[PDB]
Amino acid sequence: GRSLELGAADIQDLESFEAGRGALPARAYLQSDAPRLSLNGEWQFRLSPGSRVAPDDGWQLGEALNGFESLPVPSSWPMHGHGAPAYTNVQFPFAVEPPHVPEANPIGDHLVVFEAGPEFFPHALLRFDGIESAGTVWLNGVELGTTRGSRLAHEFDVSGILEQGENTLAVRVAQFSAASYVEDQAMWWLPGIFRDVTLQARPAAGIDDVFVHAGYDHITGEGILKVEASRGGQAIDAVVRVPELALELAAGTEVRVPAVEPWSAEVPKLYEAAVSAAGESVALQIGFRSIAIEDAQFKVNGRRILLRGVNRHEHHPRLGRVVPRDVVEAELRLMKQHNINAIRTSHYPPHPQFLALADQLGFYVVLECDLETHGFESAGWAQNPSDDPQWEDALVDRMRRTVERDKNHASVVMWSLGNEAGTGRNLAAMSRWTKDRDPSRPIHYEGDWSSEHVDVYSRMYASQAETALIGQGIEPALNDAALDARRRAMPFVLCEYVHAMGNGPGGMSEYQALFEKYPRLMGGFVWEWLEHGITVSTADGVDHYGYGGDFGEEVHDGNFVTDGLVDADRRPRPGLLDFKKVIEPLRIDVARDWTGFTLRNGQDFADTSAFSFRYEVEADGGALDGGTVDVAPVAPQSETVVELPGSVAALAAGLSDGRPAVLTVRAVLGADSAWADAGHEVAWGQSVREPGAPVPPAPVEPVQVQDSELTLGPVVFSRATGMPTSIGGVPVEKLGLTLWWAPTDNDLGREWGGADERPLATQWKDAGLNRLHTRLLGISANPGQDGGETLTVRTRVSAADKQYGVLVDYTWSTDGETVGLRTQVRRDGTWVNRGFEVEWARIGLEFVLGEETELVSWFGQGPHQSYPDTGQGARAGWFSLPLAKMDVEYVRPQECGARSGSRSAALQLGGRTLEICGDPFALTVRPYSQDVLDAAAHRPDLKADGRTYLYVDHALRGVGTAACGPGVLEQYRLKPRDADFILTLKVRS
Amino acid sequence: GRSLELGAADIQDLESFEAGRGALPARAYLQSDAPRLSLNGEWQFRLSPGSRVAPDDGWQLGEALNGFESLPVPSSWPMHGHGAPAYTNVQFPFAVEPPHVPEANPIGDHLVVFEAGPEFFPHALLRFDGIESAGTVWLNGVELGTTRGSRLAHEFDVSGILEQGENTLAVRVAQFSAASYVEDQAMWWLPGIFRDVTLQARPAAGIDDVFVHAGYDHITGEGILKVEASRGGQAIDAVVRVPELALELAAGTEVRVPAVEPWSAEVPKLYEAAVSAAGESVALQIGFRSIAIEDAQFKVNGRRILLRGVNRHEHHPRLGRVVPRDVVEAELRLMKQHNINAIRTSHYPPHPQFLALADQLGFYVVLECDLETHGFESAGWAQNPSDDPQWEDALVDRMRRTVERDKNHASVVMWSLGNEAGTGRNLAAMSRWTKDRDPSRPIHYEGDWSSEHVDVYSRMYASQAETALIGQGIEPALNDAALDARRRAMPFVLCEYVHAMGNGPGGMSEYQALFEKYPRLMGGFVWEWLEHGITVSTADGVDHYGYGGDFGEEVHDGNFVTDGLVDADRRPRPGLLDFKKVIEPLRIDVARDWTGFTLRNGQDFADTSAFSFRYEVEADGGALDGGTVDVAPVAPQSETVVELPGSVAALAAGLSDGRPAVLTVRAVLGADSAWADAGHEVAWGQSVREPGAPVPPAPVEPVQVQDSELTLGPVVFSRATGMPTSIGGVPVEKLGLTLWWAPTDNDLGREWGGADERPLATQWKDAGLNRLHTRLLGISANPGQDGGETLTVRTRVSAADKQYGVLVDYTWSTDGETVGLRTQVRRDGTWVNRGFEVEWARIGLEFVLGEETELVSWFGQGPHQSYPDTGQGARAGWFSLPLAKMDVEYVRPQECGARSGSRSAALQLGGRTLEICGDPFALTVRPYSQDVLDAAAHRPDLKADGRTYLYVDHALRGVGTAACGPGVLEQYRLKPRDADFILTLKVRS
Structure with missing residues (x-):
């Protein structure tokens, strides 16, 4: 009664704890003048579900093809229809019982035919720079060996096996092996021959390995050079020549170069080099640097x-x-x-x-x-x-x-x-x-x-x-x-x-x-x-x-x-x-009075000589002045105060008080580099002359009363709900308080610390912030100016089954042209749920407008988004974008697109323009609601309904990094409080 | 600057803490000989979203109809298209801030016209037996009053308001009111005039209220009778006559009836009664009973x-x-x-x-x-x-x-x-x-x-x-x-x-x-x-x-x-x-030797005289004997031993040992009752002569070996997987261990107690029992009888990312006709996840068969399902059902349909029949997989894929009541253990 199970031999191999067999010694990747044929291209490919059904039908010989179809090598074969990719973070996708492998183990048989010219005889090798996860290699039917280490190189000697003329290379690759247990990175599981396959000649009197040693003596400026060279594991005679330093020396001997230009990420000086034997020469790039x-x-x-x-x-x-x-x-x-x-x-x-x-x-x-x-x-x-x-x-x-x-x-x-x-x-x-x-x-x-x-x-x-x-x-x-x-x-x-x-x-x-x-x-x-x-x-x-x-x-x-x-x-x-912006290597601090700027060289080796220092003064009507200033090179970790031309500061004082103006100083590449063109921005700083708070309009328009409607200048109200139904021409479908945003990825991560470890998203859902309702308490007019009068609308906002809430009072005013809106928020009961204090995403307003917005403009921070603990790269200025470009294409849709620090904004709805001004507020405009945003799992789930969802925020929460690591920092948290804020509205055209 | 909000008056009312106004005194529901017109039928109906938009357009008068459509009264109007029903358990569907109500408050205006004949003059009233939640009533345009208490009666005097000829009744009903706060039952929120509306004449010299007092003296057998009668709240002269007891007495006087037959749920004796005044008579049913x-x-x-x-x-x-x-x-x-x-x-x-x-x-x-x-x-x-x-x-x-x-x-x-x-x-x-x-x-x-x-x-x-x-x-x-x-x-x-x-x-x-x-x-x-x-x-x-x-x-x-x-x-x-079965009022214990049965009268008052005591002996080939036995009446809370006819016990001993036979004694209604026909079953007991364990077949058939397949008699194997691909004719697509079932509603409830309060369903998901995988360890033949041999298949079952598991060994055998299957389960590592011990739903086998099952038969407990801590009503016998009738139509699909205590089973797949025998096992057969069962939210989500999913279980867990209250009891829990069990298979035709 022997054993009857199939494929036990292959599985015994896949479950082996040993490194691959039959490979040449591990050595350096070298640029060599030896002949070489890359085998990359279209290979033939057969996929089997597991070892036990993988055919043992002599397919290595490459004749009487059965079931093979074309496949490009290198490749990750699930990216080409065969099977599918699969992603796990920590967890293994198979039962954890090392070294064993599951029955469902994709086996990929690879095969290609190639011509070997006489230049690849007598000696040659085959090189595989990566096979995930377990390779077995045959050449012309004879086994060369196996590979372990999916992202590591392997070389197999083909002397006496390679034959002049055509040759048949066959490679069986298994997705899962004992090596999978040690390759559990957070990423997709993707098997295949995913890196170069190469045939290389190995001439006599050649060079197998080389080990460069290029130290730097930062006191004397000397370079310390020793280039080892070996063959078959033994040191060999070889001359190494570096032309730029005028050096010819034998491998294996350390010399002291009188002066070298050290290598760094900032200044990557490289000296071209060759180390030569009679049969082979390999070219090198040497960077002199010592680490300590x-x-x-x-x-x-x-x-x-x-x-x-x-x-x-x-x-x-x-x-x-x-x-x-x-x-x-x-x-x-x-x-x-x-x-x-x-x-x-x-x-x-x-x-x-x-x-x-x-x-x-x-x-x-x-x-x-x-x-x-x-x-x-x-x-x-x-x-x-x-x-x-x-x-x-x-x-x-x-x-x-x-x-x-x-x-x-x-x-x-x-x-x-x-x-x-x-x-x-x-x-x-x-x-x-x-x-x-x-x-x-x-x-x-x-x-x-x-x-x-x-x-x-x-x-x-x-x-x-x-x-x-x-x-x-x-x-x-x-x-x-x-x-x-x-x-x-x-x-x-x-x-x-x-x-x-x-x-x-x-x-x-x-x-x-x-x-x-x-x-x-x-x-x-x-x-x-x-x-x-x-x-x-x-x-x-x-x-x-x-x-x-x-x-x-x-x-x-x-x-x-x-x-x-x-x-x-x-x-x-x-x-x-x-x-x-956070890692900018130069720091630029523009002086408030615009007479100059402090420059701190944050670099470790280079000075400021590679940079051009440029300034511009921008106003609402465009650029007012600009130029470039000369800066004596500043040493690493040093700083100086650079003066700006007097015309700049004279222009600062000439501005009528209240007018907005931005001075920007930029550190830019004076010349092309290997990684950017001249004009590339590296660092920058700004000094802003803010526009003064907008004047509240005089309440000289009265509130005319009708049966179902109220009118106060350009804004029409629903007398039942108490909210606006139109402002100017543009219809308003809803106006309410906001306290919630569609959870970010971070919001979904656990709040480690305390007895409350529910994700912030879950804390919100339990507390009901996503499902707020508003109850009208009263509507009242009040005496204003010269016969005019304000309109006050009192509401209370809460959630079903909850007792805590906020009192929200809207006092409206107008002088006929611009509308004045004051909002007052008051805490009612204690904001606690399931024994823990509720926090808020935001304190703001949702305007749901009855028409689409083609374009959004604002004065504030941009162009891209900014939240309290982000937006470092959002700079002050004037910005304008189509509605689609206001949004951010995260793969899972989520809260995004807010522009913090906004002073004014303009939405363009058809042939009408809605202006919003007031104290600093955050701006967000979307063609879909928050609920459809939070519901969506991919971008296609986002549907424009024909409306404009406008969000004006007097306060925002941070975003943190709670998906993994610290949540929002204390200073950026938003606990329930009382609040007041003023806005001004206007419709033109 | 006055107030401008609408509907403040109606809302002030809805938010009132007072009981309704304008109603007559609360009194008893009485069967009266006074004229009466039921207003039920098709009324007219208008729905408004809230009080503030509910029109105040004189609709009470019932003329110049605007927006009204037909609606039947009584009704719950969301059941008739207007709006929709809504269900919450504990939580309110609106913000909790009593007595206030939300802006979204359906207001239903109801209106009907009716003819009032002279018999309803001078005095009359209108009666509403239920309005959810807040009624306001008008008659011919004048307000009668309001109602509070959605399931309580209200009466309004219409004297001097009702007019001879036609009349217009108008009722405004609001869904939500201050009363909603005190009507938070776990059920659907359903507003409307949902109970009878009636016009009742109130003649002079009538009877408004009556209070019956009918006590019983259980020592003497006397009845203690006093019937109070009143009008306008004051006691009045009235004669009360009960013909059966030959009594004529004045209301308000207590008398002692020499002998009465007491009233009970078991014997609900009722005496017809009338209490009469000159202007009105009300008919009554009196039940004499004293509570203490x-x-x-x-x-x-x-x-x-x-x-x-x-x-x-x-x-x-x-x-x-x-x-x-x-x-x-x-x-x-x-x-x-x-x-x-x-x-x-x-x-x-x-x-x-x-x-x-x-x-x-x-x-x-x-x-x-x-x-x-x-x-x-x-x-x-x-x-x-x-x-x-x-x-x-x-x-x-x-x-x-x-x-x-x-x-x-x-x-x-x-x-x-x-x-x-x-x-x-x-x-x-x-x-x-x-x-x-x-x-x-x-x-x-x-x-x-x-x-x-x-x-x-x-x-x-x-x-x-x-x-x-x-x-x-x-x-x-x-x-x-x-x-x-x-x-x-x-x-x-x-x-x-x-x-x-x-x-x-x-x-x-x-x-x-x-x-x-x-x-x-x-x-x-x-x-x-x-x-x-x-x-x-x-x-x-x-x-x-x-x-x-x-x-x-x-x-x-x-x-x-x-x-x-x-x-x-x-x-x-x-x-x-x-x-x-659990609450059966009689206990019947059949003697093992079938000579008689112990009868215990569990009733509190009645004897056994209403019951016929019947016996039957059933065998595989049908009924063998039957009859009815005479039982002297047994008093309440008493018991006796009833002998059965000697032919029964003689038949017991005559059974060849090993033959199955069931004796059932039933307590049935000897005569029709007001609640069931004669022949209705009330109680029952059984004594079973079990069939002996099935003989394992002699392993005289050898295992013939091929390249990809193994055969051992009628069962064909996949040599790669080691599992059967067919048995007899019927194909097998998969065979594996089971440890999991699609969570019940109880499984979804929290396991209060300990640091682990995750629902059992969640404990399973985290532990991975829903996503088991199996790895083949070896396949081996072994010497059997007379040249034959067994086939042993060793597997290990576990889940991805988990180290714990069970070793599963299948040893197969056959003599050509019946297949012998032995299963051995061994624990590998420790079954713990997230710091808590994993429990199992079951220890069993899933057979996925490649053909549909038309009919399922078995010997065991039935006809309906049975789990370890249920199935009290499943009795021993022979059962046969179509596949659809094996299932249970719970609204959310879930684990159900298991038949515990099965000794044999027969599935009929086309023209072939699969027999399964062995020690007691649980049987379940479905046309869909477990995954589609667990995925389904409603019955339509269940799709037959064309296969048969057969489940044979050597152990099951209980179901408990963890959805609310105790989880599974200790004795019915299923912790991980080792296990062994034998089965026998056969295909005939």
């Missing part, structure tokens, strides 16, 4: 740096893991254009080509190993591979391949062991290995807060408050004295902070102020650069992004995959516009 | 009674509050047919005609005042009308009208102050008033547990455990000694228990055993009699019931309105079938 930890500060080339970073995942809306080069270059430019200078490769090594672009454009790169076991946390870390001895060789291998591939690039300033893999022996082994191999780069890892085997203390999403304690060196001690002394001598980095999901992130300014002032604080990497949205079309042809659950997942985490500063197509979100 | 509380026992006519009760709401699927008389009679018969003997009029007085039917058919009635302020609880009872002095006159009035209307009916044995209105002064005033007016009926009220102003200690939904402590008189003491001594001397009643929502109720037997054994325990009233479903049709024409939220409610409580023993059309639910 000193006095609890992370220093480069002798200077503490500030990391302005983002977390970079590799994703493409239509192609999955495959990110085309032109997209990589574009997004890296876009980062530079937004003052970013650092990248964490969350949480696996990137495409090999990435590293050279980083060297060239200038980023401080945290290079992270492909390791994460986060789904074990929910079980108390039981069975965690990070501390299971059987997993040691697999994890050491992952780190080795990571380090070896990218070790020659000046842009890599930290090696990271992985992400959210807990604590354990194997993580210590990975660190010990790295410290031995490359002592030149400090080691990062957040998972072990004791920081026992790292060189920098890292955390994710620590509050502004805890960050400030750490900055001062007074955080709580570890229980072990020896470890505590060590950790307090380490600088501190936030490897993930200010979670950028939906509307937000809020609180960026408070983190940034701490980064300045506290040297120990290295900076932070925003989570994250890009939304992982997957494009999906409908019959009519409109496009929207799909998120967790939109692809039939049984187990998923919704829209958490869409949590980035740009959308999947790299279109900015407002968060990115704000982030740019 | 003695030795902490609620006694009638000297004997402690047992209340077998239901809570009766008034509802009709298409007509709302209007319940047609033929429906009332039908449902009251249906109650009697299910052994019910008591009714609580939850929570308002019923239609006046109700009381006579109760007197006639025989129910102990708890008559409840129209009062409930339950929506104030969530605010700590702040602003509760029950303790607000301004509400005293309105609430005293409610009680007065309640008592006065129904005070002549022997069926009313308790007056109840209302329901869930908290505690306060006005409730004490209502009690003081009642105790003064009618000392003959003890007072009920649950809201005040101290029981300071009541005569019985009442509770709702107290656990079986607390009920048992109360039964023994050892419950915790009140802090006040004086009140505690009082309360411990009171008998105890559950005014609501065993909540009958969805599948259930469970735990009825445990309550009932306590009711026996503990005299102090009065019994209980099930919540509730009927589901409040509202019929709603679709284009294709199918009907389904609507529940909270299906009618566009902004605020609602879902399907809680559907929580009854019958559906809105009085079709029984399984709960009713079980309840009948």
